[PDB]
Subunit: 64 residues, 12 copies
C-alpha cells in the first residue's frame, strides 16, 4: 500500500528546486519515499522580499 502527502515546497531559484524542497522534507520524516507528482505551481510576489517559486507535489511512500 502507498500513501501520499500533499506538500508545497518553496525556492527562490526555480520550480524544480521548489519540488526538491518538498521532497527533502518528506524524506526527513518518512521512510520509503518512492515518487512525487506535481499538482500545482505558482509564484509568491507580494508577501516576500524575493519572488518565491512554489511547487505542490503529492509525495508517495510505501507503507511498512
Amino acid at each position: 500500500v502507498f500513501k501520499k502527502v500533499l506538500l508545497t515546497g518553496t525556492s527562490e531559484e526555480s520550480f524544480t528546486a521548489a519540488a526538491d524542497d518538498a521532497i527533502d522534507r518528506a524524506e526527513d520524516t518518512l521512510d520509503n519515499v518512492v515518487w512525487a507528482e506535481v499538482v500545482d505551481q505558482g509564484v509568491e510576489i507580494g508577501a516576500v522580499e524575493e519572488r518565491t517559486y512554489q511547487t505542490e507535489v503529492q509525495v508517495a511512500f510505501e507503507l511498512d
Copy 2:
C-alpha cells in the same frame, strides 16, 4: 514547506459555516494554519434529521 489536510466540515446552516467547521478542527490540532481551498460542496439529506451542508477544504499549514 506547507502541508495540506483534506477535511470535510459540516453545518446545519450554510456552506460557509461548514467550511469554518473544518478550519476550526484544523486549528484545534495544528499550528500555523494559513489558508483553506474549497474543493467540494454537498448536502446530506437522507441520513440526518435536518439537511446538513458539507464543505470539503484542503487546509494548508506551514511546517516548523
Copy 3:
C-alpha cells in the same frame, strides 16, 4: 440503485439558499431524496431586478 437529476435552484439571498431551492423542488416530486452534490454556482445580474444566486446540484434519490 440511485438516480440523479440536475437542478439549478435560485435565491435572492445566498448560494446556500439557492441549493435549498433545488432540493425543495426535488422533494416536492420525488421520494427517497438522499443527497445533493454542488456542481456549479453563479449569479444572474442583467436579466433580473435583484441579483439572483444560482446553485446547480445533482440531486440523488434512491429508486424503489
Copy 4:
C-alpha cells in the same frame, strides 16, 4: 459580444458576500454587467486578523 474579467472578492462574513464584493467592483467600472460564474472559493487565515472568505468569479459584461 461578451467579455469576462476574472475577479476575486473578499468578505469577513460569507462566500456569497465575497462574490458580491467582486460584482460590486465590476459594476463600479463597467457598463452592462450581465452575469458572474463562480470559479474558485477559499479562506485566508494566516495573513489577516479575521478569517477572510474569497470567491473568485468570471464577471461577464456586454460590449457596446
Copy 5:
C-alpha cells in the same frame, strides 16, 4: 468533521481487490472509516513478476 487519507492499494487479481487492499489498511489504523472514493487506477507491469493492479482511493473517516 471527516478527514481523508490518499491511499493506493494493490492486487494481483483486480481493480476491486486493489481498492479493498487500501481500505483494509485504513481500517487497521483508523476508527470510523465511512467511505472511499476511487480517484485513479493503473497497472504496474515492468517492475513486478505478475501484473499488479493499483487503485487509488480517498478514504474518509469521521473524526472523534
Copy 6:
C-alpha cells in the same frame, strides 16, 4: 437523438457488478439502451453490513 440517465449501481462483489446493476435497472424501464459510460466509483463502508461497491454510469438510450 440519444438521452442519458445518471444512475449509481451497487454490488457487494465488484465495481463491474455495480455497473451491471445500474444498466439492469435502465433496461427494466427503457427501450433501446445502447451504451454506458463510467463517471465515478466508490465504496460505502460505514452505513452498511458489508462493503458496498458503487459505480456511477451515464446510461445512453436511443429516442424513438
Copy 7:
C-alpha cells in the same frame, strides 16, 4: 428552478446542426426551454453509411 436533460443530437452536416437536432427534440416535449450547453462532440464513422456528427448538450428548461 431549472432542470437539465442530457441529449446527443446527430447530423450528417455539422456540429451546429447536431446541437440543433437535440434542442429540437427537447422543444418537442418540453416547455420553457431556455438554453443549451455543449458538453461533448464526436463523429460516428464505422457504423453508418455517411459520417454522422454528434453534439451532446445539457438542455436547460424552466420548471413551472
Copy 8:
C-alpha cells in the same frame, strides 16, 4: 509576452461564425492577434427571437 482576453462571440448561424464574431471584435481593438482557443460553446434559446449560438474563446495577442 502574449496576453489573452476572454470573449464570447454570438451568431444566428453557427458555432464557427460565433467564434469569428469574437475574433472580429478583438481585431477591432487590438494589434497583433495571433490565435484563439475555444473554451466553451452553448445556445441561447429563451431570451432571443432566433436561437443564438455562443462560442467563448481565449483570444491571444502579442504585447509590444
Copy 9:
C-alpha cells in the same frame, strides 16, 4: 482492441470541416476507422493569410 491517434485537422471554412480533414487523413492510412472524439478547437490567425480553424480529434480504429 481499439487504438487512437491524436490528430489536428485544419480548414479555412469551419470547425466541422477541420474535424473532417483529420478523419480523412486517418482514413488514407488506416483501416477500420470507427469514431472520432473532439478534444480541442482553436483558430490560427497570426501565422496564416486566412484564419485557419483547427479541430483536434482522437481518431479510434479497430486493430486486426
Copy 10:
C-alpha cells in the same frame, strides 16, 4: 524516454479483464512495456450480443 499508446481493451467479463486485453495487445507488439494508466471505462450494450466492458488505458513503454 517513455512513449504511450492509447488503447481500448474489451472483455465480456470485467473492467479488469478489459484492461488486460489492451495490455496483452501492447505486449504482442512492443518491447519494454512498463505500466498502464486507466483513462476511461464504459460498456457497449446495443451493438453486441453480450454486454462488452471497455477499459481505455495509456500503455507506457520504454524507448531503446
Copy 11:
C-alpha cells in the same frame, strides 16, 4: 478585490524564466502584483531559431 490577467511569458532557457518573463511584464504596468498561478507550459519549436519555453500564468494584483 483582486484581478487576474492571463499572460504567457517566453524564455530560451527554462520554464521558470518564462514565468518570470510574464511577471516582469505585469510589474511594468501594474501596481500591487501579489501572486501568479501557472496554468499551462509548452515549447515552441517550428517557428523559432531556438526552442522557446512558454509558461502561461494568471497574474493576480490587488485593486486600489
Copy 12:
C-alpha cells in the same frame, strides 16, 4: 494535419531538461516537429540512484 505523440522525457537536473529530452527523441525520428505541450510532471525517487525529473509532453509534428 498535425499529429501528436505522447512522450515522457527524463533528466537528473530539471523539469525543463526533461521536456527537452522528450523533444530531442521526437526530433531524432520525426520531421517537422512544431511544438510540445506539457501535460504532466513528476519525480522518480525510489527506483533510481539520483532523483529523476520526468516531464510528459504531447509533441506535435506536421504531416507531409
